[PDB]
Amino acid sequence: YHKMYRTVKAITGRQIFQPLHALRNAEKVLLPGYHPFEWQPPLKNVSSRTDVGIIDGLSGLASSVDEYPVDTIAKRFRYDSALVSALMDMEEDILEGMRSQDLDDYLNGPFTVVVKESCDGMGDVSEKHGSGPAVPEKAVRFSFTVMRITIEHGSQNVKVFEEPKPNSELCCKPLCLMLADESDHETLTAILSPLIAEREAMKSSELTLEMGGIPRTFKFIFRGTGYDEKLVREVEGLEASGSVYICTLCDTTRLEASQNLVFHSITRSHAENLQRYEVWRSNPYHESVEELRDRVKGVSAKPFIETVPSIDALHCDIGN
């Protein structure tokens, strides 16, 4: 861009393109940590500062010689700041959507925003030379997408903004990038737990933002659909590879899955996974390993992400 700007200026005489420092100054309007926002009620264990930007993804993890060795690099945004920036980037879009439905403009009803959470690891990313720990040649990305924004009008609920192309690269807004391995569980939990804490805090609060000259309040609902089967199993419970238990939505075993396969019902959740893990760890009924596994229905770990029990269409097509 600098070469283009320099040559265009040199030839035409005028200044058609803007300089790099001007672009950098205009950049800060869109990046997280520029707009003032207030939470009501205040988020639990989340600071109220409105100037937080690119913070280390390690979340102040210990890196001394006497404790668990860390060999990852991670940079991430605060969830609330990222969502504030995402909402303000589509400020004119939200105004246009509210206008097109024959509603008001300065209406300050509580917006019900649904956000899809997507996380997928990668492979074959080359490690650089240079200062840093022995960071493995794998990367894991965490990103969020904004599907629908609704405001409460009258008695029913009216829609404002729907993503036209949800599966595009122009709406998968990044949230946390760590260059680690998804096979490892300790580092994954260590880097990803603060984001889950922020999400849980935001699940029970409201955000006030000066939206186009009139203050409006937001409420958020989250859905973690953008995971593949291996990550779902490695996060919210059931053992990896291929077990006797297969589906992530029901307690159906492989044999009766092959037998009936037409009559079922979705049963699994996250609270049920936590209760089943507690049952597995305590063994109140004094059962052996096999009958305890049959009682616990396959979960043998502590889940830490509330993943919506859904199916991923892309990997479904690939496997099928």
Partner: protein
């Protein structure tokens, strides 16, 4: 001072820094794996057997009434007197701390197979906060056996935690706790002779005293060359705890304890500074009321040990110490494991 290289089977990706090795009736077992339990070993314990310098990990089944406990990544080791084994707290693989207590025991043993019995107990009274890196040990005073606890490292309290510093740790309170295993009780005791915290230290048992020496204090980022001797008696009323500062202590943190002979323990490994490693060995000769730390000849290390940054290990019990060196990048098999013999 024998240094023998040991090979490992198809479970090398299952040992991580911070494990713990327990010795039951001359048999050494394993605990504290990497990752959650798999379908191959739903329990988490293993048959840590070395024959001809080859390591094989066979699963070991728990009892019917035992509790299937998560892998603690940094527990506290205790050896009660019927021969049991006690672990307290630590990090789960999801990186949350636990304030719970577990006691190891053998429910039944048959030919070439062993079944464990892990029990669940709840502490009432002055319950210690969840932590890791601490040390626990038991004393036998006036015919009464009762365990003592010391502070370590823990996360910031639930009032000053922020997500930006979610994983920042702070040393626990200097308080010294007394644990009554047979009843599940604990009464806090604050002693003016202990003002600063202490983490990753070694605990040595005796008839009525515990010798805590070395360790790392995070507040001042220093490793004191101190040595505290805590003498506890068991009268009819409340217990009396006395801490006395002794001269001649060494400055080592995250060291390894071994019991070679009666009234004779050896210290090897650890870190002196953040970028420095403990290249020497200390032989602690206990007595009735006397402690004399002397420097014995340095065992013949290899280049890989002398040039590495990290080592970790636990106690075999039978005069052997199992320490490992990080092999190489994941890209031999990411870990090199050695064994060490002390007479």
């Amino acid at each position: 001072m024998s240094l023998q290289m040991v090979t490992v089977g198809h479970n090398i990706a299952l040992i991580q820094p911070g494990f713990s090795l327990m010795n039951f009736d001359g048999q050494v077992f394993f605990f504290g794996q990497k990752g959650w339990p798999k379908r191959s070993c739903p329990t988490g314990v293993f048959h840590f057997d070395i024959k001809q310098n080859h390591l094989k990990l066979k699963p070991a089944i728990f009892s019917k009434d035992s509790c299937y406990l998560p892998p603690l990544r940094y527990p506290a080791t205790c050896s009660y007197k019927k021969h049991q084994y006690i672990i307290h707290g630590g990090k789960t693989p999801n990186n949350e701390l636990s304030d719970k207590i577990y006691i190891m025991s053998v429910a039944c043993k048959n030919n070439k197979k062993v079944t464990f019995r892990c029990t669940e107990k709840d502490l009432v009274g002055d319950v210690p906060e969840p932590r890791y890196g601490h040390s626990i040990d038991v004393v036998y005073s006036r015919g009464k056996s009762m365990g003592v606890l010391f502070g370590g490292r823990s996360y910031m309290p639930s009032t000053q935690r922020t997500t930006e510093k979610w994983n920042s740790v702070a040393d626990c309170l200097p308080h010294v706790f007394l644990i009554d295993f047979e009843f599940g009780c604990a009464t806090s005791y604050i002693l003016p002779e202990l003002q600063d915290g202490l983490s990753f230290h070694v605990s040595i048992a005796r008839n009525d005293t515990v010798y805590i020496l070395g360790g790392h204090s995070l507040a001042s980022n220093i490793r004191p060359a101190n040595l505290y001797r805590i003498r506890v008696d068991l009268p009819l009323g409340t217990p009396a705890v006395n801490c006395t500062v002794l001269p001649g202590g060494i400055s080592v943190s995250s060291a390894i304890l071994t019991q070679t002979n009666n009234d004779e323990f050896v210290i090897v490994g650890g870190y002196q500074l953040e970028n420095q490693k403990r290249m020497v060995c200390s032989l602690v000769s206990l007595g009735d009321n006397t402690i004399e730390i002397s420097e014995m000849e340095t065992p013949d290390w290899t280049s890989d040990i002398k040039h590495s940054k990290i080592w970790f290990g636990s106690n075999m019990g039978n005069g052997t110490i199992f320490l490992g060196i990080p092999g190489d990048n994941k890209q031999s098999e990411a870990f090199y494991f050695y064994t060490l013999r002390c007479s």
